[PDB]
Amino acid sequence: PLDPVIQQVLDQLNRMPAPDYKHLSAQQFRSQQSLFPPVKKEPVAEVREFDMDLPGRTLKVRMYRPEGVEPPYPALVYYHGGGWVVGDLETHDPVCRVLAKDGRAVVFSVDYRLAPEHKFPAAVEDAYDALQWIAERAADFHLDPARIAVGGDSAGGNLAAVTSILAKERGGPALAFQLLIYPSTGYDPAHPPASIEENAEGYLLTGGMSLWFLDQYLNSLEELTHPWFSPVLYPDLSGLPPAYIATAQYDPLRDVGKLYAEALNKAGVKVEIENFEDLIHGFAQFYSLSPGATKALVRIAEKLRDALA
Numbered sequence: 001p002l003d004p005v006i007q008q009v010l011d012q013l014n015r016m017p018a019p020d021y022k023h024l025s026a027q028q029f030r031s032q033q034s035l036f037p038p039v040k041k042e043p044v045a046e047v048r049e050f051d052m053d054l055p056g057r058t059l060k061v062r063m064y065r066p067e068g069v070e071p072p073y074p075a076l077v078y079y080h081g082g083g084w085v086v087g088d089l090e091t092h093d094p095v096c097r098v099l100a101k102d103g104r105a106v107v108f109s110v111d112y113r114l115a116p117e118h119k120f121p122a123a124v125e126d127a128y129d130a131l132q133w134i135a136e137r138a139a140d141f142h143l144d145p146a147r148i149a150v151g152g153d154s155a156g157g158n159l160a161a162v163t164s165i166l167a168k169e170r171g172g173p174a175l176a177f178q179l180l181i182y183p184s185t186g187y188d189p190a191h192p193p194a195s196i197e198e199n200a201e202g203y204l205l206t207g208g209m210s211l212w213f214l215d216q217y218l219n220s221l222e223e224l225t226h227p228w229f230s231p232v233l234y235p236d237l238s239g240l241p242p243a244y245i246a247t248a249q250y251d252p253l254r255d256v257g258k259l260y261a262e263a264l265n266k267a268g269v270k271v272e273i274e275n276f277e278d279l280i281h282g283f284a285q286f287y288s289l290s291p292g293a294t295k296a297l298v299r300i301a302e303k304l305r306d307a308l309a
């Protein structure tokens with residue numbers, strides 16, 4: 001079935017007017033993000049924010065150092081979700097804390113630029129350049145160069161997967177692991193995985209909502225098959241960092257996640273994929289509220305922990 005609290009979330013959500021994507025704007029939708037209930041912020045030894053001055057832009061970064069972990073620390077460069085349009089350092093702050101605290105790794109939450117103000121592939125360039133910037137400063141952050149992972153949820157998982165591919169092409173930096181939480185890893189639009197139609201409606205992330213995101217992020221039809229947008233279409237996935245993929249049973253992106261796992265495995269990359277049976281897309285954001293989401297996110301963090309051990 002469906003997690004009890006998730007069920008109550010959808011009930012409260014379906015009480016609202018049917019979204020009007022034809023007229024919804026990025027600003028309007030960013031406001032709707034305040035609808036997410038307050039969540040518990042797990043404690044960490046330290047939270048620090050700093051600027052990364054990159055060509056053309058300064059990206060904010062929130063670093064979370066967990067308690068009781070000795071340097072050189074393993075790290076996770078994290079990219080928040082939100083369809084490449086919404087979200088920020090605050091929306092996924094609770095998520096990053098859990099990953100740091102139970103993942104036993106220093107998490108760097110990257111405030112990448114959002115569309116439509118910055119269309120594709122700005123976010124992608126930000127994800128990569130941010131990882132480069134942080135790895136370059138491994139020493140300054142007391143990080144173990146060999147234990148730096150990339151990860152993210154939804155659009156964030158997409159950015160992590162694409163960043164991995166770009167690091168491979170550019171000879172670095174070294175990525176030890178890929179944490180992809182119900183990621184949007186792409187697929188050939190002409191041949192969608194079964195979950196796209198199956199969970200198209202009523203489970204928070206909907207077909208219409210994804211369409212709306214795509215219209216804000218992408219510039220043209222042709223980019224739907226662009227590898228930087230659909231990493232699963234990249235011609236050669238071998239040599240990519242080993243990965244852990246979490247999918248949700250009621251997520252339209254469920255089989256998309258499975259598609260990437262399958263693709264990575266076929267390319268000889270070690271990959272573990274787990275489907276959470278009673279959850280929906282975005283369940284991490286209900287950490288400490290939903291019992292299913294809480295155990296799932298903690299589990300995901302422990303998967304990360306074992307990965308960087």
Ligand SMILES: *S(=O)(=O)CCCCCCCCCCCCCCCC
Nearest residue numbers: 009012013035036081082083154155
């Ligand atoms: S991915 O990046 O493609 C998925 C991005 C998720 C976008 C979610 C947009 C959500 C608007 C949510 C309003 C939620 C209100 C929740 C509380 C209701 C009880």
